Nucleic acid binder design. Structure first.
Lengths: 91, 119, 123, 71
RNA sequence: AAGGCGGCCCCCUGGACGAAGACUGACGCUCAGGUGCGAAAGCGUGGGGAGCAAACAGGAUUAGAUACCCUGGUAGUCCAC
RNA sequence: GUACGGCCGCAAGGUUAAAACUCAAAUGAAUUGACGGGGGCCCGCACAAGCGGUGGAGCAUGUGGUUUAAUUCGAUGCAA
RNA sequence: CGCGGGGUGGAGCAGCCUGGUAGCUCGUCGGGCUCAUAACCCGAAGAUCGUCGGUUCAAAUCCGGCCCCCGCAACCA
């Protein structure tokens, strides 16, 4: 079956650091796992308007090829926000 | 710039001239072409392609457009892609089948007319 | 060390590098104000210090301090600058001479007036 | 003496720059470099990247301001 | 001399030290420039290739883990010039 | 030990070798502490050896949070 | 009327042709580690396994419908 593995994208994870581990996150998805993005804000229940949805959204948008995301969640639970990412579903 | 003037009258005129030029006012432009769209098509990139028929003038690529329905303007913007068939020509004359699509325009309805105008 | 060595290569004193090259060994220089602004200083200080960028009669363009409380200076102000760094403002190596050319004196000064271009108040 | 052309306008912490530095966007118009007031730093008072804050602005340089009111 | 040199045997060869006395008769010391030597990695051509192992792949650990650990493994490590 | 120039190298690079700019320091050894999941030696219910617990349940109680007109003020890692 | 692959817990999976209490990850809430946080570690919560009829000892897995998502497909100016 499809497993849950995970990646994180903290703030201060931009292109450099970031898309290196977008490569890591391909890898997760491409094993045939459902790769769960966890944001972990320096922040709160509304940390950001920046932190999350640059990253997350560009992770989707770059990975969009292979993966898509289940939801663009933008409901933070705690000081951290799960964007859930899956294999792109065959219709 | 070094300019010397024998009389004060030739000076008082040109300083004004320098000032008049400084101004940058656009009070309205001249439509380049007016076209009506029919039989919308779907595109992955722009989200929509509205088939068009130019009734007057010539449609151009980078010139701004005014999308209006029933005399009121539903939407405004500048063309990104002007494409007829697979040709993707930058210019379309009047009474020639034409094609159009733009980003950030969600709803294409028949009967409305798009007004393109040069600046 | 060797005498022989010094005889081949004499003692050679280092040439002093200046701290106010824009002055070119002049006591003051004149210049037009290019930008007039404020800037914050270095650890541990904190303020909005008045400085200006000034293009000098000799082409050099430098930043210069505008000391005193209050000044009426703007772009195209023609001022006189003198040597004198501002320590908690790196890059700032000159001072503006209050009360010369377009630069006014400090308003209402009573002590140290001559360092701020202030006439002696009738009294 | 100390002139009085200072102001106390408010704004919101935008960026979390280095060494108690912030992008603080003035509710008024724009944002300024805003540094943390001595007082405030002495009494600690960490300052998250998204707080309503009070700024002291010298007309001399509107581009800059000091954070006075903690939150 | 420094770099560095370790199984055993032979061949070619440099230096050091000791004993005794004979010979030469200051032929000495140092050395900018010059010349030669100079670990490992690296480079070129052709060989060689057990073990090890940059790179790389896979398995794990971890919040992440382009690492540390594991299973593999190419250059390289070996020979000649 | 960078740039420019020269010489050298198939290359990687080497060699010679500056200035502007910026700071009031940078540095060496030793000293008294503190600290160590750098090291050595040594102590304490610190571990180890044991006996009984807390973490589950119901209630008492304090705090946080949430609520409120008000839930008065303070105590907040071991040391609230 | 027209193809693909799927429906299990909040989200994504495993348990499949090998039909007997549905377990494994990220989140959730706690506990532990730290001076403290991140990270990490011990843990508990969390389900008509889409929905029905068939079929059977007992069918998650067994068939077919209703139905839904994705897949490409179809609208590819």
């Amino acid at each position: 079956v499809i497993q849950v593995k995970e990646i994180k994208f903290r703030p201060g994870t931009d292109e450099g650091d970031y898309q290196v581990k977008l490569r890591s996150l391909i890898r997760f998805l491409e094993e045939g796992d459902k790769a769960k993005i966890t944001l972990r804000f320096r922040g709160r229940e509304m940390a950001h308007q920046q932190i999350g949805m640059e990253v997350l959204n560009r992770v989707k948008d770059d990975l969009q090829e292979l993966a898509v995301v289940e939801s663009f969640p933008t409901k933070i639970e705690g000081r951290q926000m799960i964007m859930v990412l899956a294999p792109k579903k065959k219709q | 710039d070094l300019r010397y003037y024998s009389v004060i009258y030739n000076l008082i005129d040109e300083v004004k001239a320098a000032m008049s030029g400084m101004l940058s006012p656009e009070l309205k432009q001249q439509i380049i072409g007016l076209a009506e769209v029919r039989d919308v098509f779907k595109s992955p990139k722009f989200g929509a392609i509205a088939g068009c028929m130019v009734t007057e003038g010539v449609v151009k690529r980078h010139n701004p457009i005014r999308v209006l329905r029933d005399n009121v303007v539903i939407y405004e913007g500048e063309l990104e892609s002007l494409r007829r068939f697979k040709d993707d020509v930058n210019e379309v004359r009047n009474g020639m089948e034409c094609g159009i699509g733009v980003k950030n325009y969600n709803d294409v309805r028949t009967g409305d007319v798009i007004e393109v105008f040069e600046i | 060390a060797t005498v022989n060595q010094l005889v081949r290569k004499p003692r050679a004193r280092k040439v002093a590098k200046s701290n106010v090259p824009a002055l070119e060994a002049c006591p003051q220089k004149r210049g037009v104000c290019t930008r007039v602004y404020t800037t914050t200083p270095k650890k541990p200080n904190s303020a909005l210090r008045k400085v200006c960028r000034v293009r000098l009669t000799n082409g050099f363009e430098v930043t210069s301090y505008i000391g005193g409380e209050g000044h009426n200076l703007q772009e195209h102000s023609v001022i006189l600058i003198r040597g004198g760094r501002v320590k908690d403002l790196p890059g700032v190596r000159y001072h503006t001479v209050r009360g010369a050319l377009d630069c006014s004196g400090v308003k209402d000064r009573k002590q140290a007036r001559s360092k701020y271009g202030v006439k002696r108040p009738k009294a | 003496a100390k002139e009085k052309d200072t102001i106390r306008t408010e704004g919101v912490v935008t960026e979390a720059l280095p060494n108690a530095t912030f992008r603080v966007k003035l509710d008024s118009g724009p944002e300024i470099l805003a540094y943390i007031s001595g007082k405030m730093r002495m009494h600690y008072i960490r300052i998250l990247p998204g707080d309503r804050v009070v700024v002291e602005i010298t007309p001399y340089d509107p581009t800059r301001g000091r954070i006075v009111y903690r939150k």
